[PDB]
Amino acid sequence: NTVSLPRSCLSTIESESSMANESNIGDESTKKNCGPDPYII
């Protein structure tokens, strides 16, 4: 009201909750990486 969609997922910097920290890791050692341009409209 050049806006662009975020280049990275915003669920990491946004510490939404304490369980959100748990949800951002799983299945042993592998890190969580959503990739480049993960968002859709």
Place this chain on the structure above:
Amino acid sequence: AALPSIQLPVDYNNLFNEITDFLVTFKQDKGPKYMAMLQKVANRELNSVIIDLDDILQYQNEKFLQGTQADDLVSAIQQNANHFTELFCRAIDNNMPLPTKEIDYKDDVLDVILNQRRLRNERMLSDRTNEIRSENLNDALREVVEDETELFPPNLTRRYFLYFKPLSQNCARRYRKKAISSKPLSVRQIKGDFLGQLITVRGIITRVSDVKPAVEVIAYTCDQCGYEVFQEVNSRTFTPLSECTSEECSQNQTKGQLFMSTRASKFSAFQECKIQELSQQVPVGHIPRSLNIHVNGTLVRSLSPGDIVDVTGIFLPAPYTGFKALKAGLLTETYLEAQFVRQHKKKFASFSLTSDVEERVMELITSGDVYNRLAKSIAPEIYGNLDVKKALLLLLVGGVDKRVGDGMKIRGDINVCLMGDPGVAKSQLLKAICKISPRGVYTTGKGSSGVGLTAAVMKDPVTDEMILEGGALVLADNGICCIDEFDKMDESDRTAIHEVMEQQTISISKAGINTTLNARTSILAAANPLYGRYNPRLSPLDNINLPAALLSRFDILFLMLDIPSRDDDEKLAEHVTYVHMHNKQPDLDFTPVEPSKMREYIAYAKTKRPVMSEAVNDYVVQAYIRLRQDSKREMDSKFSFGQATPRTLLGIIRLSQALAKLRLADMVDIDDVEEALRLVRVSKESLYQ
């Protein structure tokens, strides 16, 4: 799991066993048919195998009626035709008899290479088995030998092509089945539900491409190891190999550079043709659509532009090729792969005598009165007009072409021109003649002009080369070209027709084109008087718009006037109104001959070449002298379309030759010249009433 499995009611081992049994067992109502075919293939006298589904259905019914079980091979082939080609190939490669003829210096090179490859295969197998036996470490021995040794695969040792042909309506109707593969369809009706099936299309061919080699498997060679590497290709483009991939070079550290070898490679002869809908198939207020056909193997050169045919083929998909921005999902393009061709009208050149044709022909001659019987069967819905029909039949048959030597040439084709008052059914006769002829074309005035006649320069989509597309006059080569509204044309078209009648060629000298075309065609024209109806108060040459020389350039020039007469009008009205009440002509003592038999008889007659005797020559010279002397006085009184000239004598000779050919005789007689002069005199009674 990803890529789940599904269950279908299709077992392929059962079908392979059934294929083998059929290939070794079928009997035609002599040994097995296909075994004899395979023996001929092995001896290098055949190149293509045709599999008829009628044989398969007969085999199935024979097995059923005596109790035992059998599978439905016909429907399986119909619904999934593309998979059974290789099944049949593999079955056939397991039964081919050994060649009973030795290979000599007069065989094809492909056969030599194939035989060398087979001998090499056997030598490698024997070497491997000997080496294994000598080690001291028999089904197991051959198994281990087969496991450790390379060979040349079966596809690189075949020499034949295999095609299917559909189920005819007769066999299915007699056996109580529904032959899907032979129900003709238009391009409109072929939708995506028919992909992967064997279907038949009815249409008219509009374009054909030149034959070129399409590579199936490329071959390379390695000087380092001596192996031969083969690269399959099934795409519009491919990437050549660079470095060797054989076991020896693969296991080593220094690999060799592959070099391409054209002679060992596998090629196919390829053509692509377009097919367009017939008028009767197009809906109301729509434009006809098209379709693409692929032809491979020995079936090439079987389609020429302008042919109405029924093509058989397997309907298969292809990758999308439109604009990227308009692609929504996995879109595809369609094409037809040809397996069998049939024509609606047989060409004369392909004629051949045989019991079936001979019986019909002999019946026709036995019935007697061939001349008038053939003449009266041309457009039997038109009353009267008998001598015009005789002239038209003679134009259909033609004369004799003579090579005089020193490169000189005299035509043997007869040109006829009709010119009369309005409403005399000239157009009906033009159209009927165009429909009877196997290579006939129909044109009307200004609708066809310029490059519509002759030819134009364009670029081939399939190949990257320039070509010439023939017009009306080139499409009817060795046929009849019908021209309506002959008097309303432009000067250029008139000049082109003039040259074509002159010397059967068209010369063009324009920007980007300097060539000569072939126009071995006959002309059938129609025209009208300059003031509508004919005016008997004016000179004949003042009632028409064409130059007098052009009129003189016709063998027969007919005048058809409409003089009211209370008597003949009654007969004409009765005929026409009867024809409208029913769908047939009124006469009962005469039966018309259908177009196929007429075409057969004309094809048989065209093989003759009668010759001139001495008495006939004396009669001809006397008649020519008398007629030439007479014509000058008439032309002086300004009452002749044209004075007699040597072209009249040549036309008389041609007509006599045509009558002799129609009689099926090796020599000419006096009666033929009598009839020729009789017709040439009849040409102009309308001008003496």
Place this chain on the structure above:
Amino acid sequence: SFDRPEIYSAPVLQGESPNDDDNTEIIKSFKNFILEFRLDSQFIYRDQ
């Protein structure tokens, strides 16, 4: 909707003369040693 093309080979000619320091000759020599070597008139390695 085509499938994947294949590649294969077969031996015809005799290439360059084999060198001693190439992998295939090493393999053949080792195979001969395994299947032939004798000790006390016995094929120890083949038997074991």
Place this chain on the structure above:
Amino acid sequence: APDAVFGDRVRRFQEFLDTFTSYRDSVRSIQVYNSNNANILPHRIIISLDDLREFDRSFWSGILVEPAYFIPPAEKALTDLADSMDDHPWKLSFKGSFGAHALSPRTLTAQHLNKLVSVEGIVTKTSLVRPKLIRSVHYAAKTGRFHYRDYTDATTTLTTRIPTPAIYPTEDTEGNKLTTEYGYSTFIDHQRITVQEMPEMAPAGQLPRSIDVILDDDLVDKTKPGDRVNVVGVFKSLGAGGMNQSNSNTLIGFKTLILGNTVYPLHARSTGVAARQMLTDFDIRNINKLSKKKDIFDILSQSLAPSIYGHDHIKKAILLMLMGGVEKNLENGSHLRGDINILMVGDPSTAKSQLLRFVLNTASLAIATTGRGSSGVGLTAAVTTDRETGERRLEAGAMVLADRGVVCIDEFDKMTDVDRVAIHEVMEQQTVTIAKAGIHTTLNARCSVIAAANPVFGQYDVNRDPHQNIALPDSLLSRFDLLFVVTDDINEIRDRSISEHVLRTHRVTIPFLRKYVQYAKERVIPQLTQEAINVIVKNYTDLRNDDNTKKSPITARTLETLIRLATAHAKVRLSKTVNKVDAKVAANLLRFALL
């Protein structure tokens, strides 16, 4: 996973289908037909937005404003009913009043996105119908099993979904090779069309606006270029308007189009879409009743253009042309004409153009042309264009479009020879032949003609022969079945009467006439009878052997004209055969026109 709102909406739409029983029996009837006749009908029905409005206003407004949330529930409910009632999923279509949501391509803006709309316009260009791969099936030779895979894209569902770009499988899970089974795979048809603003509604002098429409499966070839069409669908956006990645460019926006679900062709004047009405039993009873009266021809004739004074015989001729004769196709391959043509030469205030415009307004399919208005390729369709795929194609002209219809020509005498030679073939052979660079075809042009012409000297002259007054080639006149001459001679009583008539105007209805003509043309095909044969033979002989000076020549075309007129009159009579009265009427009309 399941959603509660989805289930509640499914339940509500099931209640809606329960309260109204027409769609239920429609589905039952479609299934019954498909079972009995196996042609296969598609699984689809039409719903009225009005009934939805009386039933549940909230659900109505949801479908109108939020189709992506309310329509899939309705389709599922309909599919559930269809699957429960019988011994492919089903789809829906919408009709009724769309209120403010009925727009045109010019007045369709970004505030209507994601909502259900209904647009009107003209079809400008279609696309080639292509198959789309949905499910592939394969075979492993080493194991003897069959596999498959499914594919989807963004345009097959109204709601946004997370992409799953599956690859085409060539191997097995264990490494073995695979073989494609083209006969066991599945393909669906696909097309794209363009719609523009109507030429009769767009502002003059201004460039037009257009919108794309996507069609699938059973709505793939329901229109052709040049039609007037009404398309109902969802105006939708796709992709990212340059938002993803940097994409510095800002000029482009979001791609938009319509995912159509309903296509309706509309009839207009001077267009290629023919008018058809639905015939109810009341209409059939009334028509079959009126068929039994003896002055039916007189009533139907006097019904035509009642605002004009007199010209009764021309009214009769126009009715005969509207009905028409029968065309014959012999097994040999010959064709015999069945159409009727009319020409009018008259004085310059004889109401020729009024009757011509009446014929334009009343015929189910008619195209209006003027002398110099259309010429060259504009009449025979002799113009060639080409696709962006490379091929060259043809596009229909005035008479090619009017196949099986009528064509009105005004100022006929103002034409030239180049197009008269062209129209000769149309009027006799009823075909168009084209031979250009890369085209050789023949198009059907079975149409009738009605025309009006002016005398040479401004007004018709009785002191000269007709040839000096008409001045048209004899071969052309022979192709016109009827030629009429009308003159205005001053007469006190006639002038008085026409005056009171014109004053009355200034201070059977057509729809029933159209229904009557449609039924008669569709249902009745009479045959020739010996009585009419004798009558026509006698009349043709007498006309051909008389000394009277005529307005036109006499040929076999006159005999065929007699047969055609007799058959058309019998068609008017709804009788399956031609009697003596029809032949006598044809002879009387021909004699009056000639003399």
Place this chain on the structure above:
Amino acid sequence: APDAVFGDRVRRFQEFLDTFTSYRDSVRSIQVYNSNNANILPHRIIISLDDLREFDRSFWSGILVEPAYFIPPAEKALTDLADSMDDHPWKLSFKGSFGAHALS
């Protein structure tokens, strides 16, 4: 999507449960107890590898050597039978002789 091998294996294990009729009544008894006493028992039963050996050697060897492909089908078959009998998914346990697969 559905798999044909999975369904065939489910059908075969259903046939196995049909030939031997102790596990059916065991499941019935567990359900009866849980209905009457409401303590809740877990939904599980024990199968004998020996009986499987007499019944179908191929299925026996599949469970012994390819549990990831043969056991989920068996659990689904047992769950289907349990859901069909009554007016959580069920699990399986193994006893009997494990042969060479008994280790430390």
Place this chain on the structure above:
DNA sequence: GCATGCATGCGCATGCATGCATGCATGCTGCATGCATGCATGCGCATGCATGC
């Protein structure tokens, strides 16, 4: 009853799993640039038709 060795808790020194951040060099990928090609048009000239004359 008295003296002595032994094994059992206090009082620690010290190494090592866990877990988080930080400067940097790496490897990848969008992107500006080079380019070929086939289609569309802006237009002038040579031909055939229409209109007086």
Place this chain on the structure above:
DNA sequence: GCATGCATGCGCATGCATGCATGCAGCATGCATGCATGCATGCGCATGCATGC
């Protein structure tokens, strides 16, 4: 019949969407280290108990 002016189709230049690659420079990320903390371990000393004289 005879001469002029206009549509019309042929022939030649030229602009422009499409669609492919290529050297390069920017940007997010894995990696070497830099370090804090809490736990266990082994290592003696003070000593309460058992044994012998």
